[PDB]
Amino acid sequence: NAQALNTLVKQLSSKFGAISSVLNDILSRLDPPEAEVQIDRLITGRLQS
Amino acid sequence: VVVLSFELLHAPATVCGPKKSTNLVKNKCVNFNFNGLTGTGVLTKSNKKF
Amino acid sequence: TTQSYTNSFTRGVYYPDKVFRSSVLHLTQDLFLPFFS
Amino acid sequence: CVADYSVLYNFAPFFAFKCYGVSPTKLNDLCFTNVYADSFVIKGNEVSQI
């Protein structure tokens, strides 16, 4: 069990090809029309995990 | 041609702050913003021996 | 300046980043002085 | 110091303003570790090489 959870909660610090792993930073540095591209990669990676 | 080359992150910070500033509160769920590091939580007195 | 030789042992460990850590074994990839040279 | 990315607008309209890392609109809200700048003059058909 522990491993299965640990890996999951670690998978939250991976970029998945984006510029950062923190949503607030992306939302505080990029115009929202240009931010869906970055957010999509994170969403896909986390869904896959 | 003029090229600006920033680099973000890292522990210290400088070259910013065209905004205002406010007071500080503890033991209260609150939004915060420290040098661009936003978020939300509850702030106490820490014991981390930095 | 009279040259000689000796081992290196386990010396040359420096704080790579300015971030507090506690009770963890972090794994780092950077330039270090190799052991036992 | 404190940076104001709005004085330079009064200087002149600009041939190209293609920011890369961050969006130019809200540059007055972040904080940077260190900022470097540089300048030079070249022909106008090689600006695409920057």
State how far the Cα of D45 lies from the Cα of B7, in Å rounded to an integer: 29
Let me know: does A17 contact A9? Beta carbons within 8 Å.
no
Q: Do B1 and D47 touch (CB under 8 A)?
A: yes
Q: Which residues of A28-44 are buried (b: 16+ CB within 10 A; e: fewer)?
A: bbbeeeeeeebeeebee
Closest residue to D32, CB basis, from B2, B3, B8: B8
Encoded tokens for B38: 């936003």
What is the CA B33 to chain-centroid distance, rounded? 5
H or E stretch at B5: strand B2-5
What is the distance between the alpha carbons of residues C7 and B48, in angstroms, rounded to a whole number? Answer: 38
Task: Tell me how crowded residue D27 is: count the other CB atoms within 10 A of its CB.
Answer: 19
Residues 1-37 of C with CB under 8 A from B: 17-20, 22
- The full DSSP string for B12-44 is --BS---S-------SS-EEEEETTEEEEE---
**What is the residue whose two structure tokens read 């404190």?**
D2
Q: How far from the centroid of its chain's Cα atoms is residue A5's Cα? A: 17
Query: What does the block give as tokens for D5?
Result: 């990315």
DSSP states along chain D: ----TTGGGGT---S----SSS-GGGTTS--BS--EEEE----TTSGGG-
Residue with tokens 């009770």: C23
User: Which residues have C-beta within 8 Å of that of residue A48, sequence separation ≥ 6?
Assistant: none
Backbone φ and ψ for B4, nearest 5 degrees, come out as: -100, 130
> Taking CA atoms, what residue in D is nearest to A19?
D21
Is residue B13 within 8 Å of residue D33, measured between CB atoms?
yes
Hey, what long-range contacts does D4-11 have (CB within 8 A, 24 or more apart)?
D4/B18, D4/D28
The one-letter amino acid code at D12 reads A
A26, exposed or middle or buried, with CB in 10 Å at 0-12, 13-18, 19+? buried
A38 Cβ neighbours under 8 A, 6+ residues apart: A18, A19, A20, A26, A30
The data reach a resolution, in angstroms, of 3.1
Distances from the Cα of D18 to the Cα of B3, B4, D25, D47, angstroms: 10, 11, 12, 11
Contact between A35 and A26 (Cβ < 8 Å):
yes
Q: Nearest CA of chain D to the CA of B26: how many Å?
A: 24
C15, C20, C21, C23, best to mutate vs chain B, most B CBs in 10 Å: C20
